[PDB]
Amino acid sequence: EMPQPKTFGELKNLPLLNTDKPVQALMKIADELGEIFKFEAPGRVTRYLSSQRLIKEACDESRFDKNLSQALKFVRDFAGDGLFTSWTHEKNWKKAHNILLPSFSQQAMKGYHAMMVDIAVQLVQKWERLNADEHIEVPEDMTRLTLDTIGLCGFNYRFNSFYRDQPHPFITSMVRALDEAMNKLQRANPDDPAYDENKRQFQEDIKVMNDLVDKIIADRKASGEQSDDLLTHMLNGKDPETGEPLDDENIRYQIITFLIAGHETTSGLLSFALYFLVKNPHVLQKAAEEAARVLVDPVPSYKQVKQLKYVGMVLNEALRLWPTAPAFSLYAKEDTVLGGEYPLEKGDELMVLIPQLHRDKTIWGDDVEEFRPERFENPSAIPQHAFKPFGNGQRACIGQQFALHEATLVLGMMLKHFDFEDHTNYELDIKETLTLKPEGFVVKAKSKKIPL
Amino acid sequence: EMPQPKTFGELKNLPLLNTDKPVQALMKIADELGEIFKFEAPGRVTRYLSSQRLIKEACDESRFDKNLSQALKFVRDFAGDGLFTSWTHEKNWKKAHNILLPSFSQQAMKGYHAMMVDIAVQLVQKWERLNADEHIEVPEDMTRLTLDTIGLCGFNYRFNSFYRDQPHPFITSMVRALDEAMNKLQRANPDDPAYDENKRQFQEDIKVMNDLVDKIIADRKASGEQSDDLLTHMLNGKDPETGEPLDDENIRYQIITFLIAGHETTSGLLSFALYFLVKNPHVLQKAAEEAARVLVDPVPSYKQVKQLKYVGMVLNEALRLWPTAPAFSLYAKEDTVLGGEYPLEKGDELMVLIPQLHRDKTIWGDDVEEFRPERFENPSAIPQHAFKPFGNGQRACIGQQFALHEATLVLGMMLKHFDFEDHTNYELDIKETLTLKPEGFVVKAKSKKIPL
Ligand SMILES: O=C(O)[C@H](Cc1c[nH]c2ccccc12)NC(=O)C(F)(F)C(F)(F)C(F)(F)C(F)(F)C(F)(F)C(F)(F)C(F)(F)C(F)(F)C(F)(F)C(F)(F)C(F)(F)F
Numbered sequence A, B: 001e002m003p004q005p006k007t008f009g010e011l012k013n014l015p016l017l018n019t020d021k022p023v024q025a026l027m028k029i030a031d032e033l034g035e036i037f038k039f040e041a042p043g044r045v046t047r048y049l050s051s052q053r054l055i056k057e058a059c060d061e062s063r064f065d066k067n068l069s070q071a072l073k074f075v076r077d078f079a080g081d082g083l084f085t086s087w088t089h090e091k092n093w094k095k096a097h098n099i100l101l102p103s104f105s106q107q108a109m110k111g112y113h114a115m116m117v118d119i120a121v122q123l124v125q126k127w128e129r130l131n132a133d134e135h136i137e138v139p140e141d142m143t144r145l146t147l148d149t150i151g152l153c154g155f156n157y158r159f160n161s162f163y164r165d166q167p168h169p170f171i172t173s174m175v176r177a178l179d180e181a182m183n184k185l186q187r188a189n190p191d192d193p194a195y196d197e198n199k200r201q202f203q204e205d206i207k208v209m210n211d212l213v214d215k216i217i218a219d220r221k222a223s224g225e226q227s228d229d230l231l232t233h234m235l236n237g238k239d240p241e242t243g244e245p246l247d248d249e250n251i252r253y254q255i256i257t258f259l260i261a262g263h264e265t266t267s268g269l270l271s272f273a274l275y276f277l278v279k280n281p282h283v284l285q286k287a288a289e290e291a292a293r294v295l296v297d298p299v300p301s302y303k304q305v306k307q308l309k310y311v312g313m314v315l316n317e318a319l320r321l322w323p324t325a326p327a328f329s330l331y332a333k334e335d336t337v338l339g340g341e342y343p344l345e346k347g348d349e350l351m352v353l354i355p356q357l358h359r360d361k362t363i364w365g366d367d368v369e370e371f372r373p374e375r376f377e378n379p380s381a382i383p384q385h386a387f388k389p390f391g392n393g394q395r396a397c398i399g400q401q402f403a404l405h406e407a408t409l410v411l412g413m414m415l416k417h418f419d420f421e422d423h424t425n426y427e428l429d430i431k432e433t434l435t436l437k438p439e440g441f442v443v444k445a446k447s448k449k450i451p452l
């Protein structure tokens, strides 16, 4: 019999998600119940997996395909049949997949590098210009950087986040829509007139996001600057299989999708990485020494970023402990037996609980809570399906190399140009908005006074 | 019998200042009544002068000395015996004057230049980074620039105004204090319990300004870097006459004074200059041609800024029409007859209405409202005391060379790097906060794509 956490009569397990930190709650449940537990709500069931033993079966694409979790079905209200919220079998998924993969080729990535540097230099200059005793609001500045990077690299659009003391309106609306989706999970009678205003606000925030997408497309339309970026591929690329391009409706959904997926989780990653660095000073020193050794020019080169091996290890270890898109959903393609123990029928759902997978002591050893970048000295040594911060198979993250190149560049420059102080002895507090991010994480920087 | 505008019974002329635009109202009164009129309030009188023939007499320092207008007396509540709000006969006036005069020498200006460029480059980069069809909020960005320039050049303190979409809190508090003082002029029964909230906010706004001053001082003493800026002279300079340095209390007053006087009127100047340029495209062409011909390096030099003659003529003509500190006050040192017609007793007050002086048709010709920089092409041709945007005599603006160097550099770079469009066909609306500035002035820039 499958373990199951505590129930609330007719509501079954649903009230367990009536919390501001649902993923962290599910992790605690996994600690108590083990590698698999059933989670029921009125009218639905899923099974949360936490061991590599079971997740390696879940990642077999002949047996399971990507499912849209409840969260993703609600995000689909604004993300449509964009890549993240489309089913594998929808024509627009494989079309967009084939059309946009070229936007993340090696040659594309080399092409984005200069614009990544543009935004990174803005970050470095902001911090150089701070006065004595001033501090840095880490997740806020990381969100400024990542949003601006996807906007510029992807769409030749400048959000100019470093010119604002508040979040860009896009961010404010995105955040409000995302945690409104985190709210809709735990609810009942959605057509209740009580939520007429919540729907009005949801539609308002969606309109804000779509108005900006309108601007991006119109600006490209009127331009004559010869762009060869993500939007270029959206507007002109043809799917080799069907021979078709994307239509205008799908393009709008892809823009929204990439603006959100293309920064939020990267800002979390950078925030967690800097957190672990300041909490582990020997690791910080080792990373700083690499940055100084490798980044010998005022502008980092593409090749130099690729040579930041230890900074890459730091980022992977941060993703191990706190993968910022912490779960993904699967359904059974056919009847099948999971783990030689659990019979599933076609259509049965699974949730992969990534932070728990990443704490599987049979894979990582007993010290799973310790921050040790050296675990990733040779990424080849990690068993298959043991480390899954970017999902699985053909439905894995399309932007993984983009995110990692950006984060490595930025963290490298940060470690080259400043020493960091955990001046408040910050107590980790992880805010959940579907994605994960340190809340209230602040540091002080002291410039090493190296020119740009 | 001296002319006098309309009266309001026992309140006399006081309610004429109960307007958001008191200087402009006084200008209209001057147009109606001529070169001199009496202005009375309960328990006080002054005489407003508008002609060069009477103002030249008023500028005779053997007969008249600087007076603190009622406005300056209320500003003195936070500016103390700083240079702007001290009487000539107060020890701390000549003392501070002697100590700080060398901080505005050519040797000093050459010293500030690099930091002026620092902030100007931030301005240019902001505008380069705007998207298609976005516009510029002119007085807002000019205030960002001028505040940051005096902060950095004067005090090695970065307000980082370009990192904010709202004004720096210092600005918010400064403006509230200034317009309170303007609004406190027109008040009858100022101790009415209705104005208690206004008194409470005024004291809060003073506290904001003083905390910022305390931080500037604290930073300097803690700092280990070698500065030789305005603050260095305030803290270490000795007056050659008395042999004394400034005491701590006076230094605080000077910092407040220079932060306010050292940026507000310069932001107005730059805003009016750009307004007149976009309203006079042939003038804009001449100024842009000069900027292109002279500013041949990505980083302008001090020598190149001195070479921008036409840009200087533009700024002077903007100061002719809209001098941004639009009046100054004098008192009669002894009994004397003004203009062979108006007998004055010792202590009698005069107000010099600078915008009206600058429209004296007997001096400038009949076309006084037209924007023609060429009036300043042969500067000795301007009669004595006909052009007084920087006040008079030993109580003249100590920062004139700073303001003009900054404004010439910045306007030069603006004209080098962008074409400008008056896309809204903006209707001049002058906001008064004691000082004058266009309100709601917006333009679009098109980059000339010249690298920095
Ligand atoms: O939605 C579900 O089915 C279950 C909770 C659940 C289980 N059973 C239920 C029954 C009724 C109601 C809810 C449940 N959700 C989760 O466990 C979960 F962890 F919250 C999630 F929903 F899985 C998730 F991890 F938060 C998440 F939403 F998928 C996610 F990973 F954070 C994510 F939001 F999708 C993302 F992938 F992280 C994302 F990046 F934020 C994103 F939403 F995909 C996105 F990229 F931003 C977007 F795609 F752009 F939105």
Ligand SMILES: O=C(O)[C@H](Cc1c[nH]c2ccccc12)NC(=O)C(F)(F)C(F)(F)C(F)(F)C(F)(F)C(F)(F)C(F)(F)C(F)(F)C(F)(F)C(F)(F)C(F)(F)C(F)(F)F
Pocket (backbone or CB within 6 Å): B014, B017, B022, B023, B039, B040, B041, B044, B045, B046, B069, B070, B071, B072, B075, B079, B084, B185, B186, B257, B260, B261, B262, B264, B324, B325, B326, B327, B328, B351, B433, B434, B435
């Ligand atoms: O204050 C007065 O005595 C008369 C009005 C008046 C006349 N009679 C009165 C009787 C009762 C009450 C009021 C009156 N004031 C004006 O006519 C006037 F034009 F508003 C003004 F006050 F002179 C003035 F122009 F605003 C001003 F005071 F000169 C001025 F603008 F404040 C200024 F001095 F020019 C100034 F330089 F701009 C400034 F505002 F003071 C200033 F420079 F910004 C500053 F605030 F002093 C500084 F920034 F701190 F330096």
Ligand code: HEM
Pocket (backbone or CB within 6 Å): A066, A083, A084, A097, A150, A257, A258, A261, A262, A263, A265, A266, A269, A323, A324, A325, A327, A328, A329, A388, A389, A390, A391, A392, A394, A395, A396, A397, A398, A399, A400, A402, A403
């Ligand atoms: C640290 C950074 C990132 C993390 C942790 C992350 C994580 C993930 C995960 C877990 C998935 C699979 C979701 C699922 O199966 O339901 C995914 C898919 C995706 N990611 Fe990311 N991602 C990151 C950065 C980015 C960036 C920078 C982009 C774009 C520039 C992006 C675009 C996408 C897209 C489009 C998909 C959907 C792919 C498809 O199904 O066809 N991601 N990502």
Ligand code: HEM
Pocket (backbone or CB within 6 Å): B066, B083, B084, B097, B150, B257, B258, B261, B262, B263, B265, B266, B269, B323, B324, B325, B327, B328, B329, B389, B390, B391, B392, B394, B395, B396, B397, B398, B399, B400, B402, B403
């Ligand atoms: C366009 C810009 C400026 C204008 C139009 C302007 C105008 C004036 C005027 C009219 C006065 C005389 C006031 C009176 O008689 O009551 C004055 C005095 C003064 N100005 Fe300015 N000014 C400008 C810029 C600056 C700057 C940049 C600074 C400082 C960096 C500054 C500092 C002062 C000081 C300290 C005084 C008082 C001088 C004294 O009495 O000893 N000004 N200014």
